[PDB]
Each structure stands twice: as C-alpha cells, then as structure tokens.
Amino acid sequence: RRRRIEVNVELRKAKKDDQMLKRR
Amino acid sequence: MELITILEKTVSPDRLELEAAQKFLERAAVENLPTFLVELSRVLANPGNSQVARVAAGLQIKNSLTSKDPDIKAQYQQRWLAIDANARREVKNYVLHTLGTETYRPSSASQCVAGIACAEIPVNQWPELIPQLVANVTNPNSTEHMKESTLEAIGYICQDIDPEQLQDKSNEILTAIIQGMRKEEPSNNVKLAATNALLNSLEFTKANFDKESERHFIMQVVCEATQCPDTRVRVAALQNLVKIMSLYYQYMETYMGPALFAITIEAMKSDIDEVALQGIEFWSNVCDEEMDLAIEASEAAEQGRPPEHTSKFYAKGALQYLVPILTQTLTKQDENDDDDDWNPCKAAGVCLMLLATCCEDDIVPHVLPFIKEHIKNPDWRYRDAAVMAFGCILEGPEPSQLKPLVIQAMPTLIELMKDPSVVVRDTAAWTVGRICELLPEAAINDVYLAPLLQCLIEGLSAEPRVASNVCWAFSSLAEAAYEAADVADDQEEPATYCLSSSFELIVQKLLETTDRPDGHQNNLRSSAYESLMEIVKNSAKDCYPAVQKTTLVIMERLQQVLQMESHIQSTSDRIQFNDLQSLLCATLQNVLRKVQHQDALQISDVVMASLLRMFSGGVQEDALMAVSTLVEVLGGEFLKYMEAFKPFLGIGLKNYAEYQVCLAAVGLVGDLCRALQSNIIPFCDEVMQLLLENLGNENVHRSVKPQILSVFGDIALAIGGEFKKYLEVVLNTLQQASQAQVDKSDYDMVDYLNELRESCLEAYTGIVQGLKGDQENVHPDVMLVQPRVEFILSFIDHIAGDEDHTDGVVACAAGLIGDLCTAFGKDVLKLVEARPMIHELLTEGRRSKTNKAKTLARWATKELRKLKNQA
Numbered sequence: 001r002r003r004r005i006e007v008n009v010e011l012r013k014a015k016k017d018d019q020m021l022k023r024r
Numbered sequence: 025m026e027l028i029t030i031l032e033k034t035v036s037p038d039r040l041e042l043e044a045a046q047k048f049l050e051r052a053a054v055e056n057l058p059t060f061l062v063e064l065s066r067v068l069a070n071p072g073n074s075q076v077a078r079v080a081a082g083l084q085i086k087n088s089l090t091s092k093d094p095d096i097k098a099q100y101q102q103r104w105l106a107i108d109a110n111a112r113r114e115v116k117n118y119v120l121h122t123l124g125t126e127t128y129r130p131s132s133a134s135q136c137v138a139g140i141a142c143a144e145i146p147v148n149q150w151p152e153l154i155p156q157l158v159a160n161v162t163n164p165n166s167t168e169h170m171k172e173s174t175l176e177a178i179g180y181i182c183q184d185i186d187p188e189q190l191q192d193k194s195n196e197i198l199t200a201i202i203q204g205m206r207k208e209e210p211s212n213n214v215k216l217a218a219t220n221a222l223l224n225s226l227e228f229t230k231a232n233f234d235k236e237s238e239r240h241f242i243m244q245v246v247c248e249a250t251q252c253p254d255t256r257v258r259v260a261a262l263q264n265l266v267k268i269m270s271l272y273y274q275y276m277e278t279y280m281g282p283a284l285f286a287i288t289i290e291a292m293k294s295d296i297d298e299v300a301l302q303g304i305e306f307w308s309n310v311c312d313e314e315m316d317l318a319i320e321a322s323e324a325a326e327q328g329r330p331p332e333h334t335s336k337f338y339a340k341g342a343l344q345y346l347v348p349i350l351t352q353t354l355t356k357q358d359e360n361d362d363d364d365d366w367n368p369c370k371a372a373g374v375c376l377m378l379l380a381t382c383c384e385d386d387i388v389p390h391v392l393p394f395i396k397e398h399i400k401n402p403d404w405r406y407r408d409a410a411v412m413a414f415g416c417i418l419e420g421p422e423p424s425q426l427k428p429l430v431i432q433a434m435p436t437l438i439e440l441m442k443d444p445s446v447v448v449r450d451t452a453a454w455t456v457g458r459i460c461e462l463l464p465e466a467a468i469n470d471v472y473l474a475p476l477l478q479c480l481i482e483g484l485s486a487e488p489r490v491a492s493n494v495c496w497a498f499s500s501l502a503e504a505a506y507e508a509a510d511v512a513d514d515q516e517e518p519a520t521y522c523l524s525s526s527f528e529l530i531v532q533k534l535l536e537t538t539d540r541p542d543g544h545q546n547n548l549r550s551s552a553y554e555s556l557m558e559i560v561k562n563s564a565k566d567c568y569p570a571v572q573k574t575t576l577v578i579m580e581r582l583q584q585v586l587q588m589e590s591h592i593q594s595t596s597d598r599i600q601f602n603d604l605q606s607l608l609c610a611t612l613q614n615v616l617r618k619v620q621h622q623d624a625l626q627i628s629d630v631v632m633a634s635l636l637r638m639f640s641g642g643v644q645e646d647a648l649m650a651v652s653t654l655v656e657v658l659g660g661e662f663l664k665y666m667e668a669f670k671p672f673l674g675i676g677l678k679n680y681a682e683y684q685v686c687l688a689a690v691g692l693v694g695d696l697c698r699a700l701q702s703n704i705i706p707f708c709d710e711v712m713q714l715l716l717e718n719l720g721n722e723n724v725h726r727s728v729k730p731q732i733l734s735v736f737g738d739i740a741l742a743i744g745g746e747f748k749k750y751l752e753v754v755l756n757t758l759q760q761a762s763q764a765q766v767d768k769s770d771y772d773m774v775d776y777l778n779e780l781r782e783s784c785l786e787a788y789t790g791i792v793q794g795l796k797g798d799q800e801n802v803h804p805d806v807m808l809v810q811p812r813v814e815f816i817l818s819f820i821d822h823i824a825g826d827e828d829h830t831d832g833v834v835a836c837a838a839g840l841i842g843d844l845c846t847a848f849g850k851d852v853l854k855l856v857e858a859r860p861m862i863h864e865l866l867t868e869g870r871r872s873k874t875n876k877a878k879t880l881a882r883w884a885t886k887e888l889r890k891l892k893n894q895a
Contacts, residue, residue, distance in 0.1 A: 001642060003554075004610050005684075008649050012691060015656065015698055016738070017876060020789070023798055024842065024883065 027063055028073060031080040049084060057103070058111040061085060065118035068132060071125045082132025085119070089139030090184070094766065094773050095726070101143035109149075116140060120156060123177065124170030131173040138180035145181075146189050154193050161200035161218075168211040175204050175217035182224035186769030191228045198232060198242070201225060205245050212254040219249055219260040226267050233272050243268075243279055250287050255296060262291055262302035266309055273313050277336055285342065292349050300353070300368040304375050307346055311339045311378035318382075327871065339382045347390040350376050354409035357447060363546065373416055380420030388421050392429075399436055404445035411440055411448060415455035418462045430459055430466040438472070441479040449490045453483055457497035464504040468522055476501070477526060484537040484552075491537060492546040495555035498530065506562035518564040528570045530559060535577065542600040553607040557614040572623065575615045579627065582608045582634055602640050609635070609646040613653040624657040632665055639672055641682050648676055648688035652695045659699045666700075666707065677714040683725035690715070690731045697735075697742035705743050712739070712750060719757060726776060730783035733761060737790020744794045745805055754791070755812060758784055762819045768828065778830045781823055785836035788816055789843050796847045806847045813844060817855050817862065824861035831874035834881065838869045842884035845891055853891040 025048070033045035053060045067073055067081040089104055091097045104112065119140065122133035137153070144150040160166060160174040178200060182190065190197060203209075204218025232238045246268070249261035265284065269276060276284065284306075291303030317335040324331040339346075353372035380387045391413050398410035414433065418426065437459075440452035456476065460467050467476055480501070483494035502523060509518030523530065537552040560571055585604055592598050612631070616624065631654055639647040651669075655662050673696075676689030693711055696704055715732050718724050736754050740747040747754075762784045766773035797803040820837045823829070841862065844852050856862050869881025 001606070004606070004646065004649065005687075008610075008613065008652075009691070012652070012695070015695070016786075019698060019741075020793070020839065021879075023793070024839075024846075 027067060028077045031067065031077045031084075032074065034080045034083075035076055053084075053088065057088070058107050061088060061107075061115050062111060062118075065115045065136075068136070069118040069122045069125070071127075075128050078126065079128060079132050082136055085115070085136045086132075086139050089136070089143060094770060097142075104140070104143045105147065105149070112140075112149075116150065116152075120153075123160060123173045124167055126169070126173065131176050134173055134176040134180055137177040138184055141181045142184050145185060154196050158196045158200040162203050168214055171204060171214045172211065172217045175201070175214065175221050179217065179221035179224055182221060182228075186767055187228035188769070190225070191231070194225075194229050194232055197225060198229060198238075202242065202245050205249055207248050207252070212252070212257055215249065215252060215254065215257045216260060219246075219257055219264065222246070223260065223264050223267060226264070226271055233275055239275060243283075247279075247283050247287060250291070255298070259298045259302055262287075262299065262306070266302060266306045269306060270309050270313060273317075273336075274333065280336075280338060289345060289349070292346075292353070297368055301366070301371055304350075304353070304368065304371045307339070307342065308371070308375040308378050310342075311375070311382040314339050315378070315382050339379060340386060343379065343383055343386060344390060346375070346379060347387065348394075350379075351391065351394040351409060351413050354412050355405045357405055357408060361447070373412055376413060376416040377419065380417040383420070385421040385425060387417050388425070388429075391417050404443075404448055407440075407443070408445065408447045408451050411437075411451045411455055415451065415458050418455070418458045423463055426463055427465060430463050434466060434472045438475055438479055441483060446487050446489060449483070449486060450493055453480075453490055453493035453497050456480070457493070457500045460497065460500040460504045464508065467501060468505055468508065473522060477523075477530075481530070481533055484533050488544045488546045488548040492548050492551040495534070495537070495548075495551040498534070499555045499558040502530075502559040502562045506564070509564055520566040521564050523559075524564060524566050527559070527563060527567050531556060531570060531574050534559070535574075543596075550603070550607060553611055557611050560615050560618055563618065568619070571615055571618050575612075575619050575623065575627070578608055578612050578615060579630055579634070582612065586634065586637055602643055605638060605643050606646045609638075609643075609650040612650055616653050616657055621657065624654065625661060628654060628658055628661075628665075632669070636669075636672070639675075641685060644676065644682075644685040645688045648685060648692050652688070652692050655692070655695045655699050660701070660703065662696075662699050663703050666696075670707065670710075674710065674714060677711070677718065680718055680721065680724045680728060683728050686718070686724075686728055687731055690728065690735050694735050694738040697738040701742050702744070704739075705746050708739060708743055708746070716753060716757075727779075729761070730780045733758065733780070733783040734786045734790075737787040737794075740787075740790040740794035742794070744797065745803075747791065747794055748805065748808065751791075751808060754787070755809070758787055759815065762815075774828055778828060778833055782830075782833050782836050784819070785833070785840050789836065789840045792840070792843045792847050796843075802847055802849075810848060813848060813852065814855060816840065816844070817852075817859060820865065821859040821861050824865040829868075831869075831872050831877040834865055834869045834872065835874060835877040836880075837865060838877065838881035838884040841866070842880065842887045845884070845887035850891050850894065853888060856888065 030045050030048050033041055034049075036042050036045070049060075052063075064081045064084050068078050068085065070078075073081075089100055091100060119133050119136045123131070123137075126133060137157075141150060141153055145153070157174050157178055161171050161178075178197065182197070201218050201221050204214050205222065209215050209218075229242075232242065246261055246264050249257055250265065252258055252261065265287065269284070288303045288306045291299050291306070294300045294303070314335050314337065317331075317333055320333055321331050321335070350372040353368050354376075356367070356369045376391075395410045395414050398406040399414075401407050401410070418430070437452060437456060440448055441456070443449050443452065456467070467473060480494055480498055483497075484491055486494065505521045505523045506518065509521040510516065534552050534556040538549055538556070540548060542549060556574075560567075560574065563571055582605070585601070585608065588601060592601055631650070635647045635650050635654070638644075673689060673692060676685050676692070680686045693715075696707075715735065718728060719732055736750075736758075761780060764777060764780055766777045768774060791809060792806065795803060795806040795809060820841065823833060823837055841852075841856065866881050866885050869877045870885065872878050872881070
C-alpha cells in the first residue's frame with residue numbers, strides 16, 4: 001500500500017513533465 | 025458536581041459517563057477558558073487530591089495548550105497568548121509549584137510546563153522558567169522527585185521547541201543537565217532523566233561545543249555516564265555519544281583515540297543487547313557521516329572550490345577491529361525471528377553493509393576469511409552468518425574485483441538454496457537477489473542461469489520466509505536480464521532477453537505462489553504479486569503475447585473475486601479479500617502499461633464495469649488508481665465513460681474524510697485533463713466546485729491541499745481560455761498558499777511546505793501555459809495574469825533565499841521562470857535580474873543531480889538569454 005501510492009505518483013508526475021517539455 | 029468529581033469520571037469505562045464528563049469540561053472551557061485553566065491547575069497543584077484527579081487535571085491543561093496536529097497547536101498557543109497575563113501567571117505558578125509533589129512517576133506538571141513554554145518562550149513571556157528549573161536541579165537540598173520531575177520538564181521543552189529558541193540559554197540549561205548527570209548524583213532516576221534531556225538539547229549547544237573547556241566538560245560527563253552501573257543510564261549516555269558524533273564530527277579528533285573508540289568497541293561486545301545496539305549504531309553513523317563527507321568532497325571537486333568539511337576516515341581506521349565483532353554478532357540469530365525486530369544481529373548486518381560502501385574493497389580481506397571458515401559449518405548459526413556477510417559486502421568493492429569471487433561461490437550458493445535450515449535458505453535467497461543487482465554477470469551466464477532459475481522456481485514452494493525472499497530475487501534477476509537487453513549501439517527498446525525462453529513458466533509459478541493459504545507470514549502473496557508486476561514490467565518485446573494472456577488472467581481473477589462476496593464475514597476472511605482486490609488492481613495497472621493500445625480498447629468495457637463495482641476504503645483508492653491508469657491508456661477514447669463515471673469521481677472528491685481515496689480522485693482529475701483535453705470543459709464547473717470546497721474546508725487533511733493546487737494547473741492547461749472564470753478565486757488562493765510559513769524546526773512540516781510550494785509553482789505554470797496557448801503566438805489572455813508576474817518572481821526569490829529547498833522546488837521554479845519568459849518576454853529579464861537570489865537558484869539547479877532540475881534550470885537560463893538577445 002506504500003508503493004501503490006508513492007510509485008504510481010512518480011509515474012504520473014512524469015506525465016506532466018514530458019507533456020510540458022514536448023510543449024515548451 | 026465538584027470539579028474533582030468530574031475529573032475522576034474521565035476514567036470510567038462507561039461510554040456515556042465518559043461522554044458526560046467530557047461535555048461538562050468542554051463547556052466549562054468554552055464558557056470561560058481562563059478560570060477553567062486556573063481551576064485545573066489548582067487541582068493539579070494540591071497533593072491532597074487523588075492521583076486520578078491530578079493527572080486528569082494535567083491532561084486537560086496539556087490538551088488545551090498543544091496538539092499532535094501542528095496547525096491545531098499554533099492556534100492553541102495563540103489562544104493561550106491571548107489570555108490575561110495575570111491569569112496565565114497564576115496557571116504558570118501552580119504548574120511550576122507542582123514539580124516534585126506528584127506521586128505517580130511520569131510527571132503531569134512537567135508536560136504542562138512544556139506546553140506553556142512552547143507558547144511563551146518564543147515571545148519571551150516566561151523569563152522566570154529556565155532559572156527556576158535550573159535552581160530546582162542544582163539546589164543540593166532538592167529531593168530526588170523534585171530533580172527528576174524538573175529534568176523531565178527540561179527534556180520536554182528541549183524536545184518540543186525550536187532549538188534556536190533555546191540557544192540563548194544553553195549555558196543555564198546545560199548546567200542543570202550536566203549537574204543531574206554527574207557521577208556523584210545519588211539517584212539513577214535523576215541521572216537517567218538528565219541524560220535523556222541532554223540528548224534533546226544537543227542541537228542548540230553549538231556555542232558551548234565551540235569552547236574547549238565546556239566541550240571537554242560535556243564529553244567527560246557523558247563518557248563517565250557510559251560507565252554508570254545502571255544499564256538505562258549507560259544506554260542513554262551511549263545514545264548521546266551517537267548523536268554527538270553526528271552533530272560535532274569535526275570536533276571529535278581529540279576524543280576518538282583517547283576514549284570513544286574504547287567505549288564504543290566495548291559496548292558492541294556487550295551481552296546486553298541494548299548496549300550492543302548503541303555501539304553498533306555509533307559506527308553505522310560514522311559510516312553515514314563519512315559517506316556524506318566523501319559526496320561533499322566530489323561535490324566541491326567538480327565544483328572547483330575545496331570542501332568546507334573534511335573526513336577523518338574513522339571507519340577505515342577502525343575497520344580491522346569492527347569486522348571481527350560484526351561477523352561474530354551475525355551469529356546471534358535465532359529460531360524465533362522477527363522481521364520488524366531490530367536486534368544486534370540485524371544491526372550488525374546493516375553496519376557491515378555501510379562499512380562496505382564506505383570503505384569498499386578494503387573490507388573484502390577482513391570478511392572473506394570469516395565466510396570461508398564458516399560457509400560449511402554444521403552449525404546453522406555460523407553458516408547463515410557467513411552467507412549473510414557475503415551478501416552484506418557485495419555493494420561497495422569494485423565489481424571487477426568481486427566477479428571471480430562471486431563466480432566461484434555460485435556452486436555453494438546454489439547448494440545453500442537447498443540447505444535444511446530455513447534461516448540459511450532465507451539468507452541464500454536474499455544474497456542471490458543481491459548478486460543479480462550488483463554483479464549480474466555472475467548469474468546471467470550460460471552455466472548458472474539455468475540451475476539458478478531452477479532453484480528459484482523451486483523456492484516459490486518453500487516456506488513464506490524463503491518464498492518471499494525468492495520473489496524478490498526473481499524480481500531482481502528479471503530487472504537484470506532486462507537492463508542488459510538494449511544498449512548495443514542504439515537507443516531503442518529490447519527484444520528478447522535470457523528469460524524470454526521461460527518467461528511464461530515463471531508468470532504461471534508466481535501466479536501459483538499467489539494462490540497459497542493467506543495470513544501467511546512475510547507477506548508472501550504481496551511479494552509474489554509484486555514480483556509478477558516486476559517481471560512483466562521488465563519484459564522485452566517477444567514477451568507481449570505472454571503479457572497479453574496474463575492480462576486476461578488478472579481480469580478473470582479480478583472478476584472471480586467480485587462474486588466472492590458469498591463468504592465475506594468475520595474480520596479475518598474479509599481482510600484477505602480486500603487485499604486480494606487491492607493486489608489485483610495494482611497488478612492490472614502494470615500489465616495495462618505493457619500491452620498495446622488496442623488491447624485496452626478491447627478490454628476497457630470489462631475493467632470499468634469491474635473497477636466500478638469495487639469502488640472498506642483501501643479498495644476505493646486502488647480502484648481510482650486503476651481507473652487513472654486506464655484513463656492514461658485510453659486517452660480521449662475515455663470520454664465515453666465520463667457520464668456514467670461522473671457521479672463516482674465526484675464521490676471520491678466530496679469525501680475527503682478518508683484523504684487517501686480523496687487524493688487518488690484529485691490525481692484522477694489530472695489524468696482526465698491530460699486524456700480529454702478541452703473535452704473536459706463541460707465537467708469542470710462541478711469538479712472545480714468540489715476542489716475549491718475542499719480547500720476552504722479546514723477539516724480536510726493537509727496532504728490534499730497541494731494535490732489540489734497542482735490540479736488547478738492541469739485544468740488550466742486542458743481548458744485554457746475557459747479558465748478565466750476561476751482566475752480570481754484561484755490566484756487569491758495561490759497568493760495565500762504561497763505565503764504559508766511553518767516552523768522550520770519541524771522536518772515533517774518542512775517537507776510539507778516544500779510540497780506545497782512546488783504545487784503552487786505548478787499551478788502558476790499551468791495557468792501561464794494554459795492562457796498563452798500551445799502555439800507560436802502568445803495569446804492576449806496571458807495578459808490577465810501579467811500584473812501577477814512580480815509576485816511570482818518575488819515568491820521564487822524568497823524560495824531561493826531558503827536553505828530548505830529541494831531539487832523538486834528548484835525544478836518547478838526554473839520551469840516557471842522559463843514559462844514567464846516565453847509568455848511575457850523581454851521585460852521579464854529586468855525583474856529577474858533585479859532579484860539576485862533567482863540567479864543563484866538557476867545556477868544551483870544547473871549543478872543538481874536531478875535531471876528534471878538540470879533540464880528545466882538549463883532550459884530557463886537559455887530562454888532568459890534569448891530575451892537578452894532580442895528586440
């Protein structure tokens with residue numbers, strides 16, 4: 001229940017990152 | 025109904041009686057807090073009252089002054105500070121006078137003193153406190169109870185207040201504490217209390233350690249107490265040494281050789297576990313401090329200037345003495361072993377690992393002998409110790425040097441996998457995993473790779489303690505057999521690694537392990553599912569078909585579990601049910617990201633229906649997270665479920681009571697934004713309504729706030745111009761948040777502040793980008809936020825001039841500066857340059873190790889350059 005949150009979050013933050021990047 | 029009577033009723037095991045007493049006290053406090061507190065303090069100060077009334081009186085006072093919730097605490101202190109000074113003075117005098125008059129050992133007055141001191145010392149309103157406490161302890165006539173109780177109050181104050189607030193009185197505080205710790209002090213309870221207080225006072229005593237004479241006096245008294253015949257005092261004193269070594273490393277060259285080495289070494293050899301643990305902890309901490317100094321070194325080195333702090337390499341010098349003690353300590357395992365139990369054996373193991381990473385190669389010659397001598401000892405204790413030691417030094421020494429060693433030990437390790445002792449196989453399974461992660465070549469070869477897989481597979485049937493470790497081993501072997509599938513000469517995805525040949529036999533076996541009688545120890549089930557999740561994620565291309573069908577199995581299983589509500593009764597049969605659902609949802613998330621896109625469109629209808637039925641509490645959070653992954657995979661094609669899913673998503677947000685599920689929902693909105701884009705506009709008024717409500721709801725957990733602010737940025741990005749409506753409310757909220765300030769003394773609240781600051785920076789980034797548009801033409805709407813640019817830049821300025829930071833904050837701030845450049849242009853250059861600390865933040869980011877902080881800080885620096893070189 002620790003990795004289920006903290007790890008699924010990292011992978012999400014990366015969504016925005018690559019999104020803002022391929023836009024910036 | 026005398027107050028003494030009501031207080032005594034707070035101890036009744038009668039829900040109603042207990043609630044009657046509470047309403048009465050809550051009403052008296054609400055009615056007239058000043059008199060309430062005064063009245064409670066009178067009760068507590070009278071030794072004529074029963075132990076129950078006094079303790080209950082003390083608890084009421086305490087709960088009126090502090091709280092475990094940082095926010096409630098500050099409000100209580102402000103409310104107390106608003107009380108008539110005369111009233112507060114009377115409460116203070118009664119509490120202080122209670123010191124030494126309490127029967128019950130743990131003092132109640134001591135806690136009340138601290139709760140008040142926390143509100144008053146920071147505003148200098150209780151100047152009488154420190155001198156009185158100091159006087160209570162140093163008075164030769166004082167009773168034992170009086171001295172102990174007072175040292176307890178000192179300890180609580182030191183523990184609950186920002187050290188910087190006690191810095192100006194360190195001399196006095198230390199006089200009391202060092203006095204209670206002297207060898208001559210009669211009571212061991214007073215020495216104990218005094219020694220525990222020192223441990224809490226070390227952070228504000230820097231000025232004192234800077235004085236040779238004071239430093240020497242403190243060291244002598246602490247080292248002296250490590251020889252106290254009382255075990256509790258010995259242990260506490262040893263913990264002070266551990267902390268002192270950590271805070272004043274650079275001041276210990278003088279003490280190491282003449283005293284600390286001897287004290288810490290002896291302690292490690294103690295038959296008393298608590299003592300041994302401190303001696304081990306002391307050396308584990310030196311390794312940690314030296315590893316960091318090395319990092320600091322390489323840092324400055326690549327940065328030019330010389331490091332400010334320089335190592336002394338105490339770990340290296342003590343190595344030849346530590347190893348033999350640690351390897352022998354490893355022999356102190358036992359049949360009845362506990363994983364969450366921190367004993368000398370486990371600690372020795374960790375210390376050995378830290379020594380290997382701190383001293384590298386240097387450790388091999390000291391440990392290898394132990395390993396060869398006992399690797400075959402009939403005694404399982406030594407056999408396990410040898411294997412453990414082997415596993416503990418695989419990280420640190422140079423691989424090239426370790427390759428041949430590990431290569432040659434493989435035959436024994438494999439046999440060890442089949443050892444009769446469960447402890448040996450447990451450790452063997454762990455060491456195999458370590459090898460896959462540190463020296464893969466030794467496993468991924470055409471001689472051991474097969475027998476290894478064979479024993480690992482067979483291990484899945486062993487006892488949970490071993491099966492679980494075998495799962496972790498498999499998890500690493502796959503991660504290794506994968507990290508060694510690409511590279512070659514190009515930058516593409518792998519194709520077919522060394523496991524592909526057996527990838528299926530493995531998924532089916534993990535699937536079987538997963539089907540074993542629950543309640544099992546060492547979270548076997550969780551480990552197998554976790555392993556399955558890892559092997560899948562680390563599968564090449566030619567694995568696709570295997571992953572495809574595994575995806576179908578997960579679904580079917582997820583469905584078979586659904587109608588399992590037939591025998592869902594008794595808190596024990598249902599707990600396994602809720603975690604099975606939780607484990608399958610998390611698994612579905614992993615294969616979902618590995619199958620093609622069409623596979624999601626051909627399965628989406630099934631999963632939503634399933635995940636829907638499931639949305640306990642822990643399951644909701646997992647369902648929502650599963651939906652987030654499906655939303656990421658479906659993309660715009662998810663718009664189809666928005667009507668049927670709308671009410672449920674709104675449910676998760678509206679709750680907040682269980683912040684966890686609420687957080688998954690907020691996270692979900694963000695994914696909905698990225699998948700739907702502008703198509704989310706029609707659902708935004710509702711979502712924004714609930715999000716804003718949560719923010720202004722002071723009953724919502726604090727960790728939801730930043731997740732929400734960050735989502736405002738995702739919505740702005742997705743809906744663009746339509747975001748104008750909320751700008752006023754959102755920017756006002758952001759201004760408030762950005763001005764949040766916690767006590768830099770609290771590490772948990774500090775991280776919170778960083779998270780929040782990062783979230784504000786992301787919202788701003790989302791708003792600026794969303795208004796500018798995604799084209800080579802800055803849209804006029806950006807101008808609506810143009811008068812907010814200085815605030816933002818200033819907000820980043822302050823963030824810059826803050827030793828806290830975090831690469832995460834630096835990254836987002838860099839990203840935002842770059843966004844402003846592209847949105848507003850030229851004039852942004854002057855504003856940034858007129859604020860020197862921003863320049864420092866950018867330079868700091870370009871140095872960072874975090875690629876995100878290095879990429880964005882670098883990109884931003886570039887954008888600013890274009891403004892410098894443009895009309």
